[PDB]
Structure formats: structure tokens, C-alpha cells
Amino acid sequence: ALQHWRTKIATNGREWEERNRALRNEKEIMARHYAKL
Amino acid sequence: RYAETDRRYRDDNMKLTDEY
């Protein structure tokens, strides 16, 4: 239904947040490592 | 909608991986 589609969009947003935050954090930390080297 | 948000999800994460 429309409510089910809204729930699917919400799940997609939650997965976006789960996948991007840690990747960006790791990128930043080892970029700091790059800068030190 | 669903198609565009899925495409944005995909290209954002593939950019993250390739930069990594």
C-alpha cells in the first residue's frame, strides 16, 4: 500500500545512513594518516 | 522517488568505495 511504500522509503534512508557514516569516518581517519606520512 | 533514491544510494556508496 502507500503506507508500505513509505515504510520502504524509510528503510532505504536508514540503510543509506548506516552505509555512508562509517565509510566517511574511515576515509577521514586514514586521510589523516596520509597527511602525517 | 524510489528509483532516484536507489540510484543516489548506489552512486554515493560506489564513490565512497573508489575513493577508499
Q: How far is A20 from chain B (nearest CA, A)?
A: 7
Q: Please state how this structure was obtained.
A: cryo-EM
Alpha-carbon distance of A31 to A23, in angstroms, equals 12
H helices present in A1-37, as ranges: 2-36
Distances (CA, A) of B5 to A32, A34, B1: 31, 33, 6
Alpha-carbon distance of A36 to A22, in angstroms, equals 21
Residues in chain B: 20
Nearest CA in chain A to B5: A12
Alpha-carbon distance of B5 to A13, in angstroms, equals 8
Distances (CA, A) of A21 to A7, A10, A13, A36, B14: 22, 17, 12, 23, 14
DSSP H or E segment with residue A1: none
**What is the DSSP-derived secondary structure letter of residue B1?**
-
Expressed in Å, this structure's resolution amounts to 3.4
**What is the DSSP-derived secondary structure letter of residue A18?**
H
